[PDB]
Design a protein around this ligand. Structure first.
Ligand SMILES: CCCCCCCCCCCCC(=O)O[C@@H](COC(=O)CCC)COP(=O)(O)O[C@H]1[C@H](O)[C@@H](O)[C@@H](O)[C@@H](O)[C@@H]1O
Ligand SMILES: CCCCCCCCCCCCC(=O)O[C@@H](COC(=O)CCC)COP(=O)(O)O[C@H]1[C@H](O)[C@@H](O)[C@@H](O)[C@@H](O)[C@@H]1O
Lengths: 529, 129, 107
């Protein structure tokens, strides 16, 4: 149904300015409840996702005349701050309609600037840009969260060089010395907006945001992340890396010198080595518990779904899994079992492997490790199916071809054919067996199909994939550093506010009211002509 | 069925009062039924198309391979009843091709299908060189 | 490369050496060596016998082989290919500079 589709709505929709003017002059109302099921969101089905307000239609259709006309109605003035069923205003509508293209970006940027300045001039006391929708998002936060990179890029650095309008600007150029220009960015609600800052929503997205990788490349955010890196996060991160390395060393030493008797636990003696060993064990288990609770805290503060859990946040999953293995080892240690060694070694191997987590923060090593992670996930799921089909087929063929009253098992034959991958195949591992010619034909066919053709194809395809991820690796590394910075500043372990940029600097000194304004401006020096 | 084949000489081999032989012969019957099904599918494919040599061996590889599998299985049946040991030699070939022909089903899966067709093309264009 | 490779090698070396022990391959040096051999195409996959937790030992070795031999060593080749394609002109420039330094020193 098309509930609320009044004549004014249709006149605007059809781009008939004459009808719009006549209906408005005749007293047609603006606050139309265009709440029909057609006019709701979910554009996948037939519908109109940016309705529920004729101002939203007037702005979204790129017609300046209509929106400029509704500023001063003859009968009933329009209100820009009018909210639809989900709290969205005209600005939220302008954000939502974007598709991240150059022409659409131009149109949406133009309309956004014009509508915002007109609303400010009509109502200087009302800060339209700060109004939140039902989800608690400003249009800036909505653009950042939803994936509208173009509008975000505009908003973060818009400026107006006019009197009584510059106080609405984000970017300023207050000082210049010949070719040198000292730009300022207010950057409110980027470091913190008390609920959801721009960095928080970009970094901790659900992984469905198409541009979560590209948003952090913009002018102010990249410099902010670099500044926070250089300020205090670099030291804390390297310190954590050092502590983790010491933890792994202690764990390895504890594991290597474990006792060799049966049926734990094992009691301390009057010697000295046992005290070092049990100290190492206690420190290891303490580390395991710490990572256990870190994993839980990560989960609870995010609650991602299956479609987001196993496609993102691999490092937290791996550290948590390490913790699980160590705790199972503890349980078995006290449960009078030998099998604690198995879980302990799996934990140890995973801990040393997870040492690669810290390559983030180092440029070249981090890019390298990201490429490895992506070329594991993309390649094993494609390769191992093909390889295992070949291996299993020829293993069953050979093992069922040979039999006597030693290689009568599918396990051993699977192993002997696996060896051909690592350059230790024999080509003769049985003798006097029936159908020698068939056996040789099968092995040679296996070797040609797998060793000579398949592995070389793996190398070639990995080459292609490498060629196609030079840039995605850089973006992902920057994102990983962003996650590290945000987590470190969010916790910080001291309950201190070190995330501030420059203090309450007197950026503007003017508002519509006769007052000054301090806006936490961050300075950037550039040189140009 | 293949892996647990008997190890006596001169087939066929008779069933006993145990249960294992019934499972084995059931597997053999299902296997041969599958082979016959693929045989007739290959014939039906050929008759409904009648491609020439210049089109037969440059296209429709999967149908040829499945038909070849069924041919090997049928030759194995013939030898099994013909009182020969060499039914093993044919059977395993079919078994090997059968597992390899599993790759035919990678179509319908985007990434796996692209991977498998790339491998097929880098087999045909490569070994002849 | 060697950071990544040594992380894998040392992690699995310590895992295997602490998994196996008796009253021959029970030292960390020997195990590090035996796992190194898998890079040069001489791994055994069976370099110990009658030892406890055989399934765990085999899983560890197979995971090591897949992570290092099949994935990492081939990835080295792929990345070297990319860098080689991208330093073709820088190599010529540096060689010209090296000849310039040689000329200046000799003169
Ligand atoms: C018995 C013995 C078994 C040993 C098993 C060993 C496994 C391999 C060990 C791999 C070592 C590296 C590592 O452990 O770290 C890697 C994860 O590698 C894997 O994928 C392992 C697959 C398996 C990065 O982890 P991260 O959580 O940073 O993922 C990023 C997100 O943060 C971010 O939001 C973005 O979404 C970004 O696109 C993501 O990448
Ligand atoms: C004794 C033991 C021997 C084991 C022998 C094993 C051989 C390799 C096994 C290969 C496994 C994959 C497979 O079997 O399937 C591949 C065929 O691979 C080969 O070429 C094998 C060469 C030999 C796709 O088969 P398809 O019929 O889809 O071909 C497509 C047409 O359909 C379509 O019309 C188009 O023309 C398209 O260009 C065609 O590709």
């Amino acid at each position: 149904y098309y509930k609320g589709q009044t004549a004014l709505h249709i006149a605007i929709e059809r781009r008939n300015m004459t009808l719009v003017t006549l209906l408005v002059e005749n007293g047609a109302d603006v606050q139309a409840a265009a709440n029909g099921d057609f006019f709701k969101k979910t554009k996948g089905r037939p519908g109109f996702y940016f309705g529920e307000l004729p101002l939203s239609l007037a702005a979204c259709t790129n017609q300046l005349a209509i929106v400029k006309f509704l500023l001063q109605n003859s009968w009933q003035p329009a209100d820009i701050s009018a909210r639809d069923s989900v709290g969205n205003t005209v600005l939220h509508a302008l954000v939502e309609v974007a598709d991240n293209t150059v022409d659409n970006t131009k149109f949406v940027t133009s309309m956004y600037n014009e509508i915002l300045i007109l609303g400010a001039k009509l109502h200087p006391t009302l800060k339209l840009e700060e109004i939140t929708n039902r989800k608690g998002l400003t249009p800036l936060a909505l653009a950042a969260s939803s994936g509208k990179i173009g509008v975000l890029a505009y908003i973060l650095q818009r400026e107006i060089h006019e009197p009584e309008c510059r106080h609405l600007s984000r970017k300023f150029t207050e000082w210049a010395y010949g070719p040198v220009h000292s730009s300022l960015y207010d950057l409110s609600c980027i470091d913190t907006c008390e609920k959801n800052s721009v960095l928080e929503v970009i970094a901790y997205s659900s992984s469905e945001t198409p541009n979560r990788h590209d948003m952090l490349l913009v002018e102010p955010l990249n410099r902010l992340l670099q500044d926070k890196w250089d300020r205090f996060v670099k030291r804390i991160f390297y310190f954590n890396f050092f502590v983790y390395c010491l933890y792994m060393i202690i764990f390895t030493a504890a594991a290597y010198y474990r006792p060799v008797e049966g049926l734990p636990p094992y009691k301390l003696k009057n010697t000295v080595g046992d005290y070092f060993r049990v100290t190492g064990e206690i420190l290891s288990v303490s580390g395991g518990v710490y990572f256990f609770f870190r994993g839980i805290q990560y989960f609870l503060q995010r609650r991602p779904s299956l479609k987001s859990l196993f496609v993102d946040s691999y490092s937290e999953i791996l550290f948590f899994v390490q913790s699980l293995f160590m705790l199972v080892s503890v349980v078995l240690y006290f449960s009078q079992r030998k099998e604690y060694v198995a879980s302990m070694v799996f934990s140890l191997a995973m801990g040393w492997t997870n040492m690669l987590y810290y390559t983030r923060g180092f440029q070249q090593m981090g890019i390298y490790a990201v490429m490895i992670e992506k070329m594991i996930l993309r390649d094993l799921c494609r390769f191992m199916f093909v390889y295992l089909v070949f291996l299993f087929g020829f293993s069953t063929a050979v093992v069922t071809l040979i039999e006597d009253g030693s290689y009568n098992s599918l396990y051993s034959t699977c192993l002997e054919l696996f060896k051909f991958t690592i350059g230790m195949g024999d080509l003769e591992f049985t003798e006097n067996y029936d159908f020698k010619a068939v056996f040789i034909i099968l092995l040679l066919a296996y070797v040609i199909l797998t060793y000579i053709l398949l592995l070389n194809m793996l190398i070639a395809l990995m080459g292609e994939t490498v060629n196609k991820i030079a840039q995605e690796s850089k973006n992902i590394w920057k994102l990983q550093r962003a996650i590290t910075i945000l987590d470190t500043e969010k916790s910080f372990l001291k309950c201190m506010r070190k995330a501030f940029r420059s203090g309450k600097l007197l950026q503007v000194g003017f508002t519509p009211d006769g007052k000054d304004d301090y806006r936490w401006c961050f300075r950037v020096d550039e040189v140009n002509w």
